[PDB]
């Protein structure tokens, strides 16, 4: 057989390459355990968020992803898997996965190319398209569409030491943009520039964006 | 700089996403100002300054930089 463990630390991404050629990417503050045995490619996504990119073309042996929440078993597939605190998200990019909510495996749900959903143990929570071809944290990137501040905030502070948080008068206002992963800072001082807010930084660790005046 | 890009007419808010992505760049702007537009697309080798000015040909806006790396998008600057 064989049998590994992974972690990557906060701000770093990791590329693995497993037994069977299989490549997988780990984003920042992530945990996965690896163990091939007869039966199953089984890699267990304990904490964070991994992509798996040119799968093995002719192993006889299922890939599974599993997570606290469920599996994703893999035909031929690239595809993102996140864990978050209350369910976990795949979204898949070429191929297809097969999604087994763990108290709900029967019948599967069928993921496609182009195809984003969450779910937790009892089942599937939301499901959406994507047009991305990759995420974009694997090329090194935020990118936001029109992304509530709160959520677009609590994805960059995956990536920090310190909190990062904005008042809630602020919560849903729209961001877009690209954002180079290689200096946060500048991602912040941007966003706050363009949505013409106050960044209150009086200790290292805490980050507040605040109205203007 | 230069970059190449392909990517296909359609609506600008999508399109800039993948802009930036394939040029690497900090592009920051106003959700609303790129909201219900629509862009040839962009195919080819370009300057980032200038296939970003091409991909927002006829949409009223331009691009906009400033003392730092990043680059941000404002309505057309008037002429006279």
Redesign the interface.
């Given at each position: 057989d064989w049998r590994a463990d992974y972690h990557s630390r906060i701000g770093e991404q990791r590329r693995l390459t497993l037994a069977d050629g299989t490549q997988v990417q780990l984003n920042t503050d992530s945990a996965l355990n690896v163990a091939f045995d007869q039966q199953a490619r089984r890699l267990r996504l304990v904490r964070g968020e991994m992509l798996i990119t040119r799968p093995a073309l002719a192993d006889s042996r299922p890939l599974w992803v599993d997570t606290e929440h469920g599996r994703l078993e893999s035909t031929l597939a690239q595809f993102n898997v996140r864990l978050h605190g209350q369910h976990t998200q795949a979204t898949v990019y070429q191929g297809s996965v097969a999604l087994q909510p763990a108290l709900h495996a029967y019948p599967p749900i069928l993921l496609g190319a182009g195809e984003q959903a969450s779910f937790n143990q009892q089942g599937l929570l939301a499901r959406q398209a994507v047009?991305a071809v990759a995420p974009?944290w694997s090329?090194?990137?935020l990118?936001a569409?029109?992304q509530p501040l709160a959520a677009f905030i609590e994805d960059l502070a995956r990536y920090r030491r310190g909190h990062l948080a904005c008042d809630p008068a602020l919560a849903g206002l729209?961001?877009?943009?690209?954002?180079?992963l290689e200096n946060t800072d500048?991602?912040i001082?941007?966003?706050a520039?363009?949505?013409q807010l106050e960044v209150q930084h009086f200790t290292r660790y805490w980050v507040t964006l605040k109205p203007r005046m | 700089a230069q970059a190449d890009f392909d990517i296909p007419a359609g609506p600008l808010?999508?399109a800039?996403?993948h802009?930036?992505?394939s040029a690497?760049?900090?592009?920051?702007?106003?959700?609303?100002l790129?909201?219900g537009r629509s862009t040839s697309g962009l195919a080819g080798r370009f300057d980032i300054d200038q296939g970003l000015a091409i991909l927002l040909a006829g949409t009223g806006l331009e691009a906009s930089r400033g003392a730092?790396?990043?680059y941000?998008l404002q309505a057309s600057a008037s002429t006279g």
């Open positions: 047009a974009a090329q090194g990137m990118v569409q029109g729209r961001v877009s943009g690209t954002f180079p500048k991602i001082a941007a966003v520039e363009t949505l | 808010a999508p800039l996403a802009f930036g992505q690497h760049i900090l592009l920051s702007y106003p959700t609303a790129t909201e730092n790396a990043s941000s």
